[PDB]
Design a protein around this ligand. Structure first.
Ligand SMILES: Cc1cc2nc3c(=O)[nH]c(=O)nc-3n(C[C@H](O)[C@H](O)[C@H](O)COP(=O)(O)OP(=O)(O)OC[C@H]3O[C@@H](n4cnc5c(N)ncnc54)[C@H](O)[C@@H]3O)c2cc1C
Ligand SMILES: Cc1cc2nc3c(=O)[nH]c(=O)nc-3n(C[C@H](O)[C@H](O)[C@H](O)COP(=O)(O)OP(=O)(O)OC[C@H]3O[C@@H](n4cnc5c(N)ncnc54)[C@H](O)[C@@H]3O)c2cc1C
Ligand SMILES: Cc1cc2nc3c(=O)[nH]c(=O)nc-3n(C[C@H](O)[C@H](O)[C@H](O)COP(=O)(O)OP(=O)(O)OC[C@H]3O[C@@H](n4cnc5c(N)ncnc54)[C@H](O)[C@@H]3O)c2cc1C
Ligand SMILES: Cc1cc2nc3c(=O)[nH]c(=O)nc-3n(C[C@H](O)[C@H](O)[C@H](O)COP(=O)(O)OP(=O)(O)OC[C@H]3O[C@@H](n4cnc5c(N)ncnc54)[C@H](O)[C@@H]3O)c2cc1C
Ligand SMILES: CC(C)(COP(=O)(O)O)[C@@H](O)C(=O)NCCC(=O)NCCS
Ligand SMILES: CC(C)(COP(=O)(O)O)[C@@H](O)C(=O)NCCC(=O)NCCS
Ligand SMILES: CC(C)(COP(=O)(O)O)[C@@H](O)C(=O)NCCC(=O)NCCS
Ligand SMILES: CC(C)(COP(=O)(O)O)[C@@H](O)C(=O)NCCC(=O)NCCS
Lengths: 370, 63, 370, 370, 370, 63, 63, 63
């Protein structure tokens, strides 16, 4: 029980903090993140010469540093979907040849996770996307309705029903290359926040893909998905802890400079105690983040700590974005204020990787509640 | 295993657990937990499959 | 003590509800609102042939109906600044000739209220905008930093310091025509919400205006301002009660239709009890709105009820906009969802007419707290 | 739409305010309340020479005044269970002879409402208490687990199952006299608050009561109960609005007198804005109370407004009791402080007449949520 | 960065958990705690043969285990005031002879911390209790208004003004033996919770104590106090994390057993998601507790982490006590329910060691807010 | 009246509504509301009873 | 009028109330209220001006 | 050290800091922090005393 980072971890962390200011779809910034090592952080050298093979804590701590120093949160979010919803299920359940095929470019080519449908969001138990096997190939059919990185994706990790009778176990996970005929993609959705992370409808119209693109055994998809959500819900939300620290830093700096009545506004407890509560929720959220990443490296059930962390972090991020605007007044409501992006992105964060309601369902479950 | 009837449902050995939705993502956790306390068995990942979890009889078999 | 609207009031209310679907700066919709009678609602026939001379309750009830049926909340907000921050101080403190000059077009020409400065927001006690009298004229100097309707304004209601030594009483209110030389206006600010209500910086560089444009006696400005804020904080926020009802209606309709697991999501208490709390806060906010408007017609100090109503309504609107998105999931985060405009507009509403912190300062004051 | 009380109502209200300081089981204070007219407020003169025949608004306004001036909230709570859970279902569904028999002493003898059981609390759909008819008599069997006024009751309004097959309609309401053989009563429960309102287990062991003691038709009990809960949830909680005003008054007085650092604590916004929020929730709760009582006199479905009012009032009362202690510091934690009774009583108020969860279920229902 | 307890720490923790069920003023339970080692946990063997010399983490973890297994929270609270507000300032600022004199019985005689006065609570800058030096002795005069352990104390750690002109530095800390003539003590105050921790007024009427009873240099008292509050606010509140876990455990067990409508109440999300939020706040509070204790062993300023932990823990405890009652219904409102003690004790916990408002003032300070 | 199946249940004219719990306190409100919009009938209090609400057939009768 | 010193400030008849900020928007409300309870006078709107509220002496004059 | 005037007060070398309340528990933290960044000095515990913190002049002395 200690909260000390190694010399090497502190150095990687300040390296992430320094990298922030070196930054349609911002392909240049995305490539710069690849060069920094962002998509390679949890990948072993065995599968990518620029993989880092870091443990979960070093990973999330670097991501936390990127979230603090990079203003384009949407871009970090896109890169983290790619790495944790796609690269990791490939690392953990792909054949050895598919791993050597796909990962070297993934660690550096873009991937998108596709499970949500028109009638499947919080409930992914009855997917309308089907995969019939024919000989050495699978034939995929159905639409996926909210694919992050859809328009820029070279590969889709698709979850489809292979056997409606096996229910929770009747689903398989595939890696569908872009360039597989039958794929069409809608234009990027206009949405509240996160403009740099494309969100698209993808339709699969008789997509024929070779057996070797399937992830794990047939019928394993629902648990492969749960395993990728354990990565996304744990590690992606490190971004938002970094962003909250920047938020808090800007509110401290502003409240100590902005004056109303030849007194600085921090002298009002309505302002200062509001900022205090930002720091309390942040330290709470950061600590729950660290705790969840540690348990994940420990071989126990870590779902409760991960659901808690995603909840605490995402809800704190929403409160952080409201409070940041409240502290800055009209300045925070204006776009040049450079402040209202937090609330716009944070409201996404209580939806994807499963809404706050669904995290609590998980928490209840792991607590023993029938 | 009236556990499935009280704890998970609030049925016999041939009721299809997967086909009719009794074992999902959440109920599985409760079941795997009960299988560890009552029978000491910790079902490895590889053997969670529709053969063994077709119903109570097939499930008891694997235990 | 009763909550019954007269036959005539119910009819005006359903007339406002029906008007909503008959709808850069949307000048056409603004003129259509003029024809409906929106800027004329509290104006007497004595000063405009299309003035309605309604009491405060009939006024706010019609405005509430417009807020429910018109999706462009920003447009309603613009029109209400014009009517309640500008037309009313003109009605209540303008000379008889200025009233006959200005009001007939105001009730139907556009007006903007300008008090905020670079260093004056929540504190309007030390305004850097000066007005030196010279003969029969006043010479205005200084910038106003957040003028709603700035770019479209034909007149500005400007508050300036005329006598720094008289402090709280050293300020005068003027009606500065657009076309007074020395006025320059910045481009519409890019801001989080309310795109249809322009927000501009206005600079006044030696603006010479005739004595007859001053509102009330010299040195009365701070209390003329407080009197216009009593109109804006009471009546403008009727819009947001109307918008919350639409929000609630869309969440009821959605939760009864959207299914997850061949059950509608309203069967989950995380959803339904969330919608219950939307209805409780709405009924609370609506009732506090009505109560404040009634007291305003009663000749007592109504500042406490008005500050309470603005607080309750604006904070409920923020919660309403978050919850509306939570209920709709990804659909509510998408722009086509037609839902995320509430949170974007609501965050403005806890700032203008004085932030939530400042309303509580007023409430404390009227409660007796030293 | 107005918020004006008649001259006569204001006078009754100040009469309730003046009555407060004229005050085991405090039988003397209870009789003094009878003399004041407390149990007679909604009873017509036709059934009691000291009945007042007041409408719901005059009733609740007087009760609100008693809650403000009487420190024994538990005693007011006991009297209101008696009047609104027992006297009213007798007035509204009793035979003419039972009304002339029971009401004159009720308006002035004590009554207790008994529905809760060991396995029936929030769900009163399957009551284990049975009533078999035999000739001209009913035979009651079963325990009631939380009877307010149990030990002091002369009559019990008992709800029993008469026909398990008719479900929601298989229940009848009876008036069981104390002195009916087979009744035994447990000692007053030790509980968190409300010491002056006894709470008892009552067992009914083959209680034979004449047909004429039944309230309404057989099988009507569940709806007779819902109708009495409409009275209790609306009118009883008027007490707590009165108590919150006293709470707020004591926090204003204390914050303006108590000094820390030769400044009064009201100069800290952590204190004063906390008291502001007490006043906002109070005005909200009071207004929702008035609105619910008005709708109840209007012949529409008023369940949504009544559930909202009970929710808002009871939850505000809990917050009021916490905040009252926070404002007073250690003094409020001490018993002589005369402050910690609010939180102790308020926590009862979110349970009886149906918990906050159950009110929201009602609200959801009346909103249309499936 | 890891969350692993050593084998020895886990064993001490389960030893604390097992000790709970081996249990006016409960002197027998207090002595049993002494035998277990509770008052000796942070004391070195150099000053007590039964001192444990544990580090802060092992200390708080054992205390957390006692808070989970001992139902008498007030007794744990009394013992922790004694150890952390009195024993520690003696260890850290007492002469070597006073340490060998006082500590062996303290580690096993009872001590009480006395700073609060009639006009000094949150502000301890102007203490009316004076200490004039005369020769080799100090003469103490003044009342202390809320002394935990007052009636049972053998020693008082008194903070008095020695030099009004040196302000924040004009205060000295003394160890006043009970049996020093001139001490009188009031009867135990009747208070909301914590019956086993006596709370008393103590008056000092010309108490003459030898120079050697002073703690540290004259004028050091205010910082000696801040240093003892760093111990009390960090380590005492470990009790409440333990108590919240018991609370949560009882709500899980109850919600999985209690049925309403032949369904267990945990199947309602109003119940289960409420319990989820209990677990989230608990894990947050526990983690902030651990983090604060670690920083305290690290030689940095740890005041911000300690104020955060006390805030988070105490406020969670209040919410825990409300929610525990909500989950249990009427059963939780009844005393035999064995549940309503949490809210009663928790409301104390947001007052002593400095109210929640004062912790935020500290947090603001350490964040840099002017 | 597939309303009872979709809106209230998410069955035929002889399924016992009261005996098996389909009409309770809440579902009654939804039903009485549907009976007012679709068929214009506002069922008076006196006639809410187990005869008329025994099942859909008896209920339709009273409408 | 030590009211201004305790209630509003927590000074004499020549201290300039408006110039140094003692009477603002909030303090005015507290003062006008005290002027209604103690002296029964309800200062009309027209006479709130810098002449009468220059200081305590001028203010007392108008009362 | 106009730091004390802006940051802590929003005065000269002889204004008594302790006697008039300018340095308390909170302001001390801000001051000790400023003394570490601007002048690199980390004032040890023993030397926080009324001699050295009597005023700015005595304080500057100890720095
Ligand atoms: C920015 C963004 C990016 C996204 N990227 C992706 C992506 O790359 N891939 C992908 O597959 N999806 C993605 N999504 C969708 C995401 O996975 C969400 O889970 C989905 O939006 C949530 O389901 P839904 O929108 O259909 O809402 P619904 O599931 O219909 O939920 C609507 C409401 O019902 C509630 N609800 C539902 N079930 C329950 C329950 N059992 N208990 C209680 N309440 C319940 C919800 O919490 C919510 O309040 C993204 C969404 C956003 C906003
Ligand atoms: C959409 C929009 C339209 C607007 N339109 C207009 C317009 O037409 N005309 C116009 O004049 N202005 C307008 N404004 C500005 C408006 O009047 C606000 O009052 C102003 O934005 C608030 O002051 P500020 O932005 O300078 O923030 P500040 O006053 O600097 O406040 C910053 C923070 O300090 C807090 N604070 C300040 N003083 C206190 C105090 N005494 N106690 C506690 N906390 C305090 C605030 O509440 C806030 O949290 C508009 C603003 C918006 C967002
Ligand atoms: C001071 C006091 C006086 C009382 N006086 C009387 C009296 O005179 N007569 C009388 O008959 N009773 C009385 N009661 C009991 C009262 O009517 C309460 O309804 C009863 O205590 C609540 O049910 P329960 O205690 O069995 O809790 P439960 O019904 O077991 O509820 C436990 C928890 O489950 C929740 N829950 C239950 N059902 C649902 C649902 N469908 N959805 C969501 N959450 C749910 C509850 O809200 C609560 O959080 C009194 C109670 C108190 C505290
Ligand atoms: C169970 C219990 C045991 C105790 N044991 C002891 C003990 O052993 N020894 C001891 O010395 N004391 C003890 N106390 C008192 C304790 O130290 C508290 O600090 C004291 O009760 C708080 O001050 P006060 O009660 O005078 O309230 P006040 O200081 O008068 O505070 C009243 C209100 O004003 C607020 N307030 C005050 N100053 C500020 C500020 N600057 N900013 C914002 N808000 C502010 C407070 O937070 C509170 O809401 C105990 C108290 C309790 C309840
Ligand atoms: C029931 C359950 C909780 C499945 O949990 P499980 O697979 O761990 O057993 C499931 O409904 C779920 O996790 N939904 C979340 C949806 C989601 O996370 N989409 C992410 C793509 S952005
Ligand atoms: C389902 C329902 C809401 C019944 O509602 P209804 O009779 O209006 O149809 C019911 O469960 C209920 O009201 N429970 C509340 C329990 C209660 O109020 N007890 C009061 C005695 S203090
Ligand atoms: C101190 C005070 C409350 C003045 O109150 P008063 O004039 O009623 O006395 C003042 O600071 C204030 O009202 N500020 C609010 C700023 C504002 O409302 N701007 C509106 C233009 S959108
Ligand atoms: C201003 C300050 C925060 C002093 O802080 P400091 O000594 O760390 O500088 C002070 O007012 C304070 O800590 N008050 C808390 C009162 C308290 O803790 N009493 C405890 C005995 S139970």
């Amino acid at each position: 029980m200690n909260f000390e980072w190694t010399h090497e971890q502190a150095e990687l962390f300040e390296h992430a903090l320094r990298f922030g200011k070196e930054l349609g779809f911002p392909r240049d910034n995305w490539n710069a993140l690849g060069d920094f090592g962002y998509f390679g952080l949890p990948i072993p050298e065995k599968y990518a010469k620029d993989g880092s093979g870091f443990d979960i804590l070093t990973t999330i701590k670097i991501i936390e540093g990127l979230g603090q120093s990079c203003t384009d949160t949407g871009l970090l979010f896109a890169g983290a979907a790619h790495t944790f919803a796609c690269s990791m299920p490939i690392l953990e359940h792909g054949s050895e040849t598919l791993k050597h095929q796909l990962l070297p470019d993934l660690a550096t080519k873009i991937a998108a996770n596709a499970i949500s449908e028109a009638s499947a969001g919080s409930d992914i138990s009855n997917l309308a996307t089907t995969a019939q096997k024919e000989g050495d190939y699978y034939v995929l059919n159905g639409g996926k309705s909210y694919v992050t990185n859809g328009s820029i994706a070279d590969y889709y990790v698709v979850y489809a029903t292979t056997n409606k009778k096996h229910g929770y176990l009747g689903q398989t996970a595939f890696v569908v290359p872009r360039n597989t005929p039958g794929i069409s993609v809608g234009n990027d959705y206009h949405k509240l926040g996160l403009r740099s992370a494309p969100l698209n409808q993808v339709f699969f119209d008789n997509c024929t893909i070779h057996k070797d693109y399937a992830l794990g055994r047939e019928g394993q998809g629902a648990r492969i998905f749960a395993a990728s959500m354990d990565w996304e819900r744990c590690c992606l939300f490190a971004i938002f802890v970094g962003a909250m620290q920047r938020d808090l830093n800007q509110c401290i700096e502003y409240a100590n400079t902005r004056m109303q009545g030849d007194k600085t506004i921090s002298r009002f407890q309505a302002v200062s105690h509001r900022i205090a509560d930002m720091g309390v929720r942040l330290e709470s959220a950061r600590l729950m983040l660290y705790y969840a990443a540690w348990q994940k490296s420990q071989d126990v059930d870590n779902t409760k700590a991960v659901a808690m962390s995603k909840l605490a972090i995402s809800e704190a991020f929403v409160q952080s974005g409201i409070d940041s605007i409240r502290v800055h007044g009209a300045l925070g409501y204006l776009d040049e204020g450079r402040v209202n992006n937090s609330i716009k992105d944070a409201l996404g964060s209580v939806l994807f990787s499963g809404t706050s309601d669904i995290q609590r369902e998980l928490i209840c479950n792991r607590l023993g509640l029938l | 295993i009236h556990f499935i009837n009280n704890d998970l449902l609030e049925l016999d050995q041939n009721t299809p657990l997967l086909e009719l939705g009794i074992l999902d993502s959440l109920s599985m956790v409760l079941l795997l937990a009960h299988i560890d306390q009552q029978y000491g068995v910790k079902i490895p990942e590889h053997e969670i499959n529709p053969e063994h979890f077709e119903n109570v009889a097939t499930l008891a078999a694997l235990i």
